[PDB]
Amino acid sequence: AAAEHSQRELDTVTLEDIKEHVKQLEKAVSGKEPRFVLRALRMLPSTSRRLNHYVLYKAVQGFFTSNNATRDFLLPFLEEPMDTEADLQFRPRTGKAASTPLLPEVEAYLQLLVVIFMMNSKRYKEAQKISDDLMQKISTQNRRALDLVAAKCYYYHARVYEFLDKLDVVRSFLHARLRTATLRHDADGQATLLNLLLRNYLHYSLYDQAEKLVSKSVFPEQANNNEWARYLYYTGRIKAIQLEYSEARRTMTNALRKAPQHTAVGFKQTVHKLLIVVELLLGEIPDRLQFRQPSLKRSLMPYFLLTQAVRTGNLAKFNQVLDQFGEKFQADGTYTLIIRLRHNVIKTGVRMISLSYSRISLADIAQKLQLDSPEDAEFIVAKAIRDGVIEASINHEKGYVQSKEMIDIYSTREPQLAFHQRISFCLDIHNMSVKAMRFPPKS
Amino acid sequence: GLPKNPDLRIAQLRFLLSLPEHRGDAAVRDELMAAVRDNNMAPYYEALCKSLDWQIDVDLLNKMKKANEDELKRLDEELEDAEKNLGESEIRDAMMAKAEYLCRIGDKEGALTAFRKTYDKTVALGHRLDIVFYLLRIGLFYMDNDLITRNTEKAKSLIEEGGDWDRRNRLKVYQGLYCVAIRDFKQAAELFLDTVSTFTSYELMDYKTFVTYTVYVSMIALERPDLREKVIKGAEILEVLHSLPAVRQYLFSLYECRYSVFFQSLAVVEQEMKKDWLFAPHYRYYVREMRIHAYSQLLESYRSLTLGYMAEAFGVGVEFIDQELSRFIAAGRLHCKIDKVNEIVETNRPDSKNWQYQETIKKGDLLLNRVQKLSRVINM
Amino acid sequence: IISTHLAKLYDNLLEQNLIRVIEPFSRVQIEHISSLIKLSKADVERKLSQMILDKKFHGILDQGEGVLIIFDEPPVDKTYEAALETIQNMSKVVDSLYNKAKKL
Amino acid sequence: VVKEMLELAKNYNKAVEEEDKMTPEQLAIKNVGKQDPKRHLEEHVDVLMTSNIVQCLAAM
C-alpha cells in the first residue's frame, strides 16, 4: 500500500529524523553541548506519532543490531515486518559503529521510541519491562546528556504507568528517582520528574502530602517553558485548596500565560476552569473574553453559568447550577472549591459596593447585598474590610463604611518600585541573552 | 443605480413580524404580503410560513410557482437560445439575468450558486463587481454572516485592482451596514461619515434613514470634538435633520448639555432600535452606551456634584441616578465614586502623569511578557 | 439671521466676560460669579460647565461647595509620550524578532 | 534624547522588520553608514542611562 510506502518513507525520514536525532545525539555526546539533544527531543513528540511496527524494527534492525541483547528485548515486544520489498538498510552504525555499544542517549531514545510505540501500541508493560530496563539501563547510566533523554522517558515511563493507572508504584519510584537528579545539579530531569510526581499526588487528593513537597523542593528556575507552565498549575491547584487564594490567581494566570501558544487545547481548558472558580472565590469577576473563545467555549460553558450567578448574586440560581452542572465539576476536580463559593457569594457584592460607593451607610449596604439585617452586614462589611477585599474603615460611631482616600501614586514610591522589578528583569534579559550568545568555538 | 434585488425592506418587515409584540401586526403583513405577490416570491413564502407558521396560499403558490416555473423555463429557454446563437456577452448576461430572478423569488441557495457560476465566466472588471455587490445584498437580506464577509473581501480585492470611484463609494456603505450589525460602531462612524455627503446607494435604505443611522452611530462613536466638526456642523447631516426632528433633538441634546431631554429622547431611540432589523441585537448595548457617555460627559466638568442635582438635571429620581452610577462605576466605565451618606459624587479622573504612567505599566507589561516569552525560546 | 448671529454673540460675550471675572480668583463660589456677570446661578452653572468641558478654561465645578476650582494645566510631559510611542515601536520589533526565531 | 531615540527606534523597526534576505550578510554591509540598527541605538541608551543613574545616585 502506498500509505505504508510513504510510511516507510516516513520511517526512513523518521529514521533520517532519528538518524538526525542519533547523529545529533551522537553529536552532543562528542559535541560537548547537551543543548543539541533538546532539538531531537522536541521533534520527539512530532516524531512520537507517525510510526508502525516496521518503523522500529528497521530502526532497531538499522540502529543497534550489534547482536546485543537490546535487539532481543524490543524486537519481540514489537511486531516485525515481513520481507518488505524496500529493505532500505538504515544502519547509521556500520560495523565498528554497530560493534561499539549504543550511547546511553540513542539507546534510550530508540528504546523510548519503542516505549513511545509501546504507548502508541498500548504496550505499557513490554514498555514497562522495556522502560524500567531502560531505567534499569539508565538508572546506572550516569552521563550528563542521558539525564535529558532520561527525563523525557521518565514522563513517558510515568506516562506508560499513567496509562497503567496505578500511579502509586511510580509514586515512590518517581519520588526517589527525583532525588537522583537533585544530587546531580541536573536541570531538566529534576523539572520533568517533579511535575509527573505532583500529578501523581493530586490524582489521589493528597494535597497535604503535595503541599509539603513544593515547600522544601525548589523548581529549577532555568527550566523548560513547557515544564514551568506545568508546575505553576499544580502549585496553583495546591495553593487554591490551601486557601491561599490571592497567590493561586497569580500563579494560575502566570501558568496560563506560559501555555504553548496553540498546541495544548486541554491544559488551557483545565487552568481556565480553576482560574474562573479561583477568581470568583477571591471576589473578582473573571474575564468575559474567556468564555467566548473557540477551544474553551463549550469546555468552560459549565463554569459560565456560575460566573453569571455570582455577579447576579441570585443564590437560588447558584444552587440550581451546582445541582445540574455540579456533578461535572467533580471530574474536573473543582466541586469542592465551588462549595466554598456558595457560602462566599456575599464577598464580591461587598467588593462591588466598596468599589463604587465611598461612604455607604451600613443600612444601605444591607439593602444592596440582600443581607438580612443591618447588624449582620457589619461583621460581613468589616470581614471584607478585615480580609483585605476592601480598603475601607467602618466608623461604628455613625454606621458608615468610609473608603480609603486614594493618593497621587506618582508622587509616592510605588511607581519607582514597580520600575525596579521591571528594570531588573530587563537588565537580566540582557545578561541572559549576552551570557549565552553561544558563539560556536570558532571553526 | 443597482437593482432592488433583494429588497431589504422585505427583510426588515419579516424581522419586525418575528418580534413578539409585533408578531400580530397586520400592517406589516400586508407590506410583506404585498412585496411577495408583486415580485412573485414563492420559495420565500414557504420559508416565511414555516418560520412564522403562516398559511400558504395554494392558488397563489401554484400560479406563482407555475409563473416561477414558466418564468424560470423562459429564462432557461432564453439561456439555451443564447448558448446556441449568441456569444459570451449574451450568455454572460443570460446567466447574470437568470440569477437575478432567483433573487426576486427568495431562493437563497439557488441565487448564490447561479451568481457564483456567472462570476467564473464574467470577464469585464465592471461586471465582476456588480455580481459581488449582488451577493452582499443577499447576505444582508438573510443576515448570512459568512457570505457578507467573504464577498466584502472580494469587493475590496476586486476594487483595488481596478476600481472606479462610484463603486468604492457604494462599498463604503455596504461595509458600514455590516459593521452596525457586528457591533463595530467606531468603524461604522468612519465609513458612513465619509459617504454622508455622497450617499448614492439608495437601494439599501432611503436617505432619511441613512442619516438617521449616521446620527445614531456617530454619537456612540465620535468624541465630542469630532462629533461637533463632523456631525453637528456637518452640512448634509443637518439638512436632512430638518425632516427628522426627533433625531435632531437627540443629536443636539447631548452636545448642548440638555440631559433631561436626552434621556427622554433616548427612550425613543431605544424603542426604534428594537424594531430595525439591523439594530435589533444591539439595541441594549446601545442604550447602555449612550447612557455612559451622557453621565461621563456631565461629570467631566464637575468634580463633586450632588446626586440631587444629577437627578434633577437628568429629570430622573434620586434613586435611579444613584443606581445607574453604581452599576456603571463598578464595570469601570464611569470615573466616579458615589457617596451615599451625603449623596455627593466625587470624580477620580487620573492626572495626565498618572494615566501615562499607568499606560507605561500596561503597555510595558505586555511587551515584557513577550520578551520573556521569546527570551526563553531562543536561549533554549 | 439677526437671532442666530446675535445669539452667538451674547453666548460669546458671556465667555469673554466670565474669563475676565474669574481671572483673579482661584476658587470662587458659583453664587458670586453670578452676581458679577448679573446672570442666574443656573445660567452660569451651565455656561461654566460647557466652558470647562470644551477646554475653554482649565477648571472644575464642585457642586457640594458651590465653587469653581480654577487651576493651571501642567504640560503633557512629552517624555512619557515619547516612551509610550517607543514601547509600541519596540513592541513591533520584538515581533519581527519572532520571525527570525522561527527560522531557528 | 528620548525623542531622538524614538525616531531611531522607528528606523530600527523598519530596518529589522524589513529583514530583507537578498543576501542579508550583504545587506548588513551595503547599509553601513553609522545608522539606525545599533550605533545610533543603545549608544544613546548608554548616554541616557548613565546620565540618569549618576543623577539619581547623586540625588539620594
Binding site: 541573552s433 553561544r438 | 520578551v371 527570551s375 | 517607543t86 514601547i87 520589533v93 524578532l97 | -
Partner: peptide, 30 residues
C-alpha cells in the same frame, strides 16, 4: 526603564541574529 528595555530587545535580537548565524553556518558546513 525605557533605556533598559531598548537594550534588552537589542540584546535578544542580537542573540537571535547570532543563533541564526552559527546555525546557518552549522547547516552550511555539511
Amino acid at each position: 526603564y525605557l533605556a533598559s528595555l531598548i537594550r534588552s530587545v537589542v540584546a535578544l535580537h542580537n542573540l537571535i541574529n547570532n543563533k541564526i548565524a552559527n546555525r546557518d553556518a552549522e547547516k552550511k558546513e555539511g
